[PDB]
Structure formats: C-alpha cells, structure tokens
C-alpha cells in the first residue's frame, strides 16, 4: 500500500500540459497553426496508469466475484472432480429423501 | 565552529554563491557566514582539482587491448536505467550473468 500510494502521489504531481514531441512530426509539416497528431501520448499514458491505479479495489471485487462463482460450481463443471466416487456419493447423500 | 555542510547538488552551490554575493558588502556585520561559505568554497575547489588530476591519471592508464562484451554492456545499461527510475530488476537478471 505504501508503494502504491507513493506511485499515485508521483503521478498526481505531474503537470496537466504534458505534450510530447514525437520526432516523427518532421513528415507532418506543422506550420505553427496545425495541431500535432501526437501531442497527447504521454498524457494519455499518465492518465491510464493513474486511473488504473485508482480502480484497484473495483478490479479486486470483480475478480473475487468471478473466483467465488467459478469455485462454487467445481463439482458440477469439472469432469475429474464430478466423476470421483466420493463427490458422487456426497451429492447422492444430500438428495436422500 | 559552524561548518556549513557540503552542498548536495549544484543548485545548492549556486545558491551558496548567491548568498555570498548578497552578503559581501556587510562584512563587519555578518563576519561569520562569510568564513563558513569560504571554507566550503575551498573544499569544493580542492575536490575539483583532485578530481581533475585523478581523471587525467585514469584516462591515460586504462588498458592496451581490453574490450567490453556487448551482452554484458546491454544488461548493465538496462539494469542501470531500471534502478535509476525506481523500477525493479528481477532476481535472475544480475546474479546469473
């Protein structure tokens, strides 16, 4: 948590006006009025990393929901677990009227 | 004594010089910051001369026919970069070379 908080601090202390000179703008003969088609490439990466670091708990929650809902159905969806005599015997024992 | 500490970076040395240049014209009043600033300047100039002499001795006594292998140099460059920008170097990256 300390490492993650430090990284988020560093990302948030960046400037907003964070254009990037791409060295391929040579072939795009910019005339001081046009807009470079790659000014926002480091800004987009900074935003992506920051937001992904801020949505960590949401990913954790969805992951644990997926894991729980796929584990609860192990004995019904996985063949070598569903076909052992012990799991079959237990599932039969539950249904004894 | 007072013993103003050694400047950590070059900006600190620049601000030391600025402070000295501001203080100069009131020596009978300050009389104590000037001496510490000048001792620091003496130490810095001494270190610079020693560094110049050691660099001269180093560059003229390197080796006759030694060379650096490219693989190791590339690994060292990448590791230096990673360590410089606070990322992590995997454990199998330096012990094995």
């Amino acid at each position: 948590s300390a490492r993650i908080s430090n990284r988020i601090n560093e990302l948030e202390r960046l400037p907003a006006n964070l254009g990037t000179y791409s060295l391929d703008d040579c072939l795009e003969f910019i005339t001081k009025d046009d807009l470079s088609s790659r000014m926002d490439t480091f800004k987009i990466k900074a935003l992506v990393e920051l937001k992904s670091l801020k949505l960590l708990t949401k990913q954790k929650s969805i992951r644990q929901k997926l894991i729980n809902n796929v584990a609860s159905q192990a004995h019904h969806n996985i063949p070598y677990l569903r076909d052992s005599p012990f799991t079959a015997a237990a599932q039969r024992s539950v249904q004894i009227r | 004594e007072i013993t103003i500490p050694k400047p950590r970076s070059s900006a600190q040395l620049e601000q030391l010089l600025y402070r000295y240049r501001a203080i100069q014209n009131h020596p009978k009043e300050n009389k104590l910051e000037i001496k510490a600033i000048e001792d620091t300047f003496r130490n810095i100039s001494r270190d610079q001369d020693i560094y110049e002499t050691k660099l001269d001795t180093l560059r003229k006594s390197i080796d006759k026919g030694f060379q650096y292998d490219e693989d190791l140099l590339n690994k060292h460059l990448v590791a230096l970069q990673l360590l410089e920008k606070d990322t992590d170097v995997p454990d199998y990256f330096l012990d094995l070379p």
Binding site: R3, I4, R7, S52, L53, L55, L56, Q59 | T87, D88
Partner: peptide
C-alpha cells in the same frame, strides 16, 4: 486481465 498491481507485489516479495 490487467497487471495493475503485479510490479509492487513482485518487488515486495
């Protein structure tokens, strides 16, 4: 599938 946290988990352990 997004390696959001992998670097820090790896460097701490």
């Amino acid at each position: 599938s997004l390696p959001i946290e992998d670097n820090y988990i790896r460097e701490v352990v």
